[PDB]
Amino acid sequence: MRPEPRLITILFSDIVGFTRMSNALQSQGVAELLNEYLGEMTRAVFENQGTVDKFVGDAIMALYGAPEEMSPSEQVRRAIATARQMLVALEKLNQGWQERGLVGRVPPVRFRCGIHQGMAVVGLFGSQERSDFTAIGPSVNIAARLQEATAPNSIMVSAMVAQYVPDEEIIKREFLELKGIDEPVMTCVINPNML
Amino acid sequence: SHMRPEPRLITILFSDIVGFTRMSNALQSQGVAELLNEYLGEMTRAVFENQGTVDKFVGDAIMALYGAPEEMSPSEQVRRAIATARQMLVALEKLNQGWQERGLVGRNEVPPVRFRCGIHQGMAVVGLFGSQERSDFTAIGPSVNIAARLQEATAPNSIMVSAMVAQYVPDEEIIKREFLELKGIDEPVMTCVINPNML
Numbered sequence A: 001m002r003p004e005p006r007l008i009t010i011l012f013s014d015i016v017g018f019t020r021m022s023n024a025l026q027s028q029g030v031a032e033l034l035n036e037y038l039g040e041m042t043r044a045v046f047e048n049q050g051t052v053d054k055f056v057g058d059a060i061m062a063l064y065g066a067p068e069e070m071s072p073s074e075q076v077r078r079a080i081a082t083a084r085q086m087l088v089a090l091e092k093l094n095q096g097w098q099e100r101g102l103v104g105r106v107p108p109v110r111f112r113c114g115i116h117q118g119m120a121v122v123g124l125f126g127s128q129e130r131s132d133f134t135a136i137g138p139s140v141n142i143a144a145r146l147q148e149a150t151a152p153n154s155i156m157v158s159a160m161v162a163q164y165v166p167d168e169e170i171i172k173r174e175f176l177e178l179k180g181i182d183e184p185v186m187t188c189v190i191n192p193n194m195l
Numbered sequence B: 001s002h003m004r005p006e007p008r009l010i011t012i013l014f015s016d017i018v019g020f021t022r023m024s025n026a027l028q029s030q031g032v033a034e035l036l037n038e039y040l041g042e043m044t045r046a047v048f049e050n051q052g053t054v055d056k057f058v059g060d061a062i063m064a065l066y067g068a069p070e071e072m073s074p075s076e077q078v079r080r081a082i083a084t085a086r087q088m089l090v091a092l093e094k095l096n097q098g099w100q101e102r103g104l105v106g107r108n109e110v111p112p113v114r115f116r117c118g119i120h121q122g123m124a125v126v127g128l129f130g131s132q133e134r135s136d137f138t139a140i141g142p143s144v145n146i147a148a149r150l151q152e153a154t155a156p157n158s159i160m161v162s163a164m165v166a167q168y169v170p171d172e173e174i175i176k177r178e179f180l181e182l183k184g185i186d187e188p189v190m191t192c193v194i195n196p197n198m199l
Ligand SMILES: Nc1ncnc2c1ncn2[C@@H]1O[C@H](COP(=O)(O)CP(=O)(O)OP(=O)(O)O)[C@@H](O)[C@H]1O
Pocket: A014, A015, A016, A017, A018, A019, A020, A055, A056, A057, A058, B063, B138, B139, B140, B141, B144, B145, B146, B148, B149
């Protein structure tokens, strides 16, 4: 539990289209959609042994390599799997909310995922009033920024991550001058399916 | 922690700082951890004393609720929230001072820490979100977006509130009123920067 510098893999995944689609539905329905979603995303993380740090609205933050130790390679492999697995759950969901009037009648829901790996102080943070497990540092910023920057329905990763990823699975490369970062960063959109 | 999602009138408060890793850049990891907590430790005390709820921590950001899970009059909601922000803004100056004199800031040119707070009141489906495997207490909806956006938009070391909130605030305590068009919102919104001090 106690905060410490460790090498971990952060995964952020947010959606775009929620608000507007539930725009119709009495909060009640809205809650039904969000939980459904969250229920899914969570499944993709736990099945791939990751840790669900937190939920920031419709955003999911997940860790790999903390609290439980995990090899930097297993970290990138499981962070990737979740991302692709999550992409499959939405399709499965968007398919159901479509056929149901919660979508299509309000564009279907879009997905944005960004993953990064690097050092980050990992521990319990907060105080007596409230204290949660989470990572903190420039590396967390990075992953997050990577996720806000990638195209809709895509997965973007840092070079640190891509080095574990087969070459032909990397769709597109590009340096991004991420806020607060001096050194522009090399980003990689990875194929959303595999090999 | 057993509350199923329900619409409700609550007051959301978001407060974020700036000068963390920059200041902490000046220390090794455990150094930031010792620092971040000192901060949060204070931020949270300002929420609890004013009887607010601490939804979550998003890094150096604090999300706090007023009017959930515990019922609270829309007026008490705005009074306890405003107070909290005012109390927060003072401890910051109190902290910065501590750090400056500690050489964590105002040295190796890491400017002292800045604060951003945005508050709004409105409807929001409050409750446990997620699913059996995982679910947390939080509010969801356009009203949450609003507060958050209000906080990202206000100047450094300032408190910005929506009209919905300002109507409970004495007129002379409102430094500025100005329409700012927020993302995803059709109707531009009337914002109010309130005096960081009472009266
Ligand atoms: N329950 C919650 N906890 C924390 N932050 C929340 C939240 N609900 C909303 N927010 C904040 O409100 C803002 C939500 O706006 P956006 O993330 O831009 C929605 P979007 O991704 O553009 O489309 P969407 O509304 O369909 O998801 C974010 O800045 C988020 O941090």
